[model samples]
Target chain A: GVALHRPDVYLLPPAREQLNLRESATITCLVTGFSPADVFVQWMQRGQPLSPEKYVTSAPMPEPQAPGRYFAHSILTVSEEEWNTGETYTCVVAHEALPNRVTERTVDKSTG
Target chain B: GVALHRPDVYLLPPAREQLNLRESATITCLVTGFSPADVFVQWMQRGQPLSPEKYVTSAPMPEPQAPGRYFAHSILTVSEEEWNTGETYTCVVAHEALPNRVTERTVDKSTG
Candidate 1:
């Protein structure tokens, strides 16, 4: 019998709704499901780990309905235009309880 | 007697605008024409869904002088950051030939 876990990553309101920015914009990442209250939420760019100075991760916020489901959010408000170019912004969740698996949601602006 | 059709929903370039974290910004929505290219593109937001967002839409691509071809726009700006609140932005494009139908795309940010 395996533990039933359904982990998923998403842009809170979807990426298409993001604010078009010439100088600055704030984007948020959300992760839902997978519980036990032990998970690390991180912001990654182009497959590289980001530092706190350039990114911020929030604590896990629990889902309102499901018993074992949870959500974590992170937001980055960049005040420079050059920072808005072709880069993949990803929010990743890694659980010590299940270290092998990492769930993520990524958005790329260059595509649009 | 009537014919069946598939009226759809969409967002052109999407409703993301550029502004500082504590500044002002504007967004736009685009649409194609109907008939020998005859249609009108209008903008809308939550709260009132009947009016365009406090911004403008561009002139109809073809102009009324050409009769069956067209595109038009409207725009508005505001201060006090009353512009950046939890509103579901939508673009409603109406077509004539296809039995008065509308296509819309919506975006909201609050639960994030």
Candidate 2:
């Protein structure tokens, strides 16, 4: 039998579509290597939450042939006027039954 | 015991590090949901293959707790002036046992 496990989180580099880069920006947060499948993820700006419409979240998908391992993607897209203010964006991930630690990743517009 | 399988491919959008836009571009190739750990992947610019230095390839790694499933990554990076020519980039994947379908994903500069 497989043992239950906590999830691992990674932050993809902030990216934008090439043609209209000055129009919007996107950041992808990938959460993988977990069990129990009922994970929650959120995108925050400088510790404040963003509108739900600004994000595109996906249900956890299995790693194809793998039996229990799972992963999910949370994408945050912000408009041009939003980044002009140079805010800090963070991804917060919490697992279903684990209270050990919350996973987090952040990107600051001024630095990215 | 798990059965052998072919790979599934995905091409991450051609992305550039934000701070230095006029210097380089990168594309990521993810080959996953396969059974055998021995998979090979190549990066092609249009129909022609690129130099090894232009790519970063990784050995297949198993899903955190899964028994027989594996995944790998191949990343391609090209210089800024090169993409100005408007080319198509593709991710080509080969499996260890199955001869079914070679997974492929492409990004055409003219379209992406």
Best by DockQ: 2
Q: Write candidate 1's Cα lDDT for B4-93 as tens digits.
A: 333223242212323343444333343323343445556655545443334444434332222343333222233325545655656666
The C-alpha lDDT values of all candidates are: 0.48, 0.66
List ranges where model 2 is wrong by over 4 Å.
A1-112, B16-20, B97-101
lDDT of 2 at B95: 83
What TM-score would you report for chain A in candidate 2?
A: 0.79
Alpha carbon deviation, residue B39, candidate 1 (Å):
43
The local lDDT score (0 to 100) that residue A29 gets in candidate 2 is 73
What clash pairs does model 2 have?
Answer: none
lDDT, residue B94, model 2: 78
lDDT of 1: 0.48
Taking the candidates in order, what DockQ does each have?
A: 0.02, 0.04
Candidate 2: which docking quality band?
incorrect
